[PDB]
Design a protein around this ligand. Structure first.
Ligand SMILES: *[C@@H]1O[C@H](CO)[C@@H](O)[C@H](O)[C@H]1NC(C)=O
Ligand SMILES: *[C@@H]1O[C@H](CO)[C@@H](O)[C@H](O)[C@H]1NC(C)=O
Lengths: 33, 30
């Protein structure tokens, strides 16, 4: 969850989503056996 | 700027906490 400028040794790396297709909500369930 | 976890016990109690921390040598958010 770090926000630092990205030097590819080309700037802020967090792209924003466009309200492309309709957004989806995803839940992943993991089980310990 | 990076997540970090501390696992410290104070004299009776064990506390584990994973946040963004300032770290000292020789506050806390998210
Ligand atoms: C220190 O111990 C007390 C109880 O003995 C506890 O309530 C407190 O949370 C502990 N300190 C930290 C920083 O967790
Ligand atoms: C805490 O995280 C969020 C995203 O997870 C970020 O936008 C925010 O800047 C962080 N807090 C601080 C004080 O940087």
């Amino acid at each position: 969850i770090s926000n630092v400028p990205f030097s590819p040794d080309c700037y802020w790396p967090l792209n924003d989503y466009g309200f492309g297709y309709q957004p989806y909500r995803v839940v992943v369930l993991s089980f310990e056996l | 700027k990076s997540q970090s976890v501390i696992i410290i016990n104070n004299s009776t109690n064990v506390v584990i906490r994973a946040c963004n921390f300032e770290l000292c040598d020789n506050n806390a958010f998210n």
